[PDB]
Amino acid sequence: GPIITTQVTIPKDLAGSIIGKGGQRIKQIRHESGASIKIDEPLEGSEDRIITITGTQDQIQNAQYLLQNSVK
Amino acid sequence: GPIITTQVTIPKDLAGSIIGKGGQRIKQIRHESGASIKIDEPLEGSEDRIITITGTQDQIQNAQYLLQNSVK
DNA sequence: TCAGCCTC
DNA sequence: TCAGCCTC
Ligand code: NA
Ligand code: NA
User: Fold this and answer.
1) Is the separation of the CB atoms in A54 and A8 below 8 Å?
2) Which residues lie across from B66 on neighbouring strands?
3) Which ligand is nearest to the CA of A61?
């Protein structure tokens, strides 16, 4: 119902696995759920990288799982 | 029992599919069966490319199938 | 995931 | 097969 936000963290060397070829993999996840999903560049000394999900309660929920399924 | 030969033909753009990364895929097939498997370069006007299996009756037989399974 | 794997 | 996919 209400439009909120979350931030997860995955290692910088799982970036390629879940982004996709010309970033086609991520585009799939975005349009499927309707979650505003954004992957960040790693800081000065950063093994992890932030993912910034942004939709309603439900829109965010699915994305949580879908972004552990191109790690397959 | 007796050591013989066969030649199959696949399109030149199925070469990559069955050869493998640094030709690791083909090396697998060779040692598995014991067949002397060799993939050829395409002639002046050649859509196909020859594969030159060379072992005993049995050694050759398996290779026949295994070289239609990296086309998967 | 799903594209491209070119070797003795 | 089985590696690497870097995008709104
Ligand atoms: Na799901
Ligand atoms: Na077999």
Assistant:
1) no
2) none
3) 1
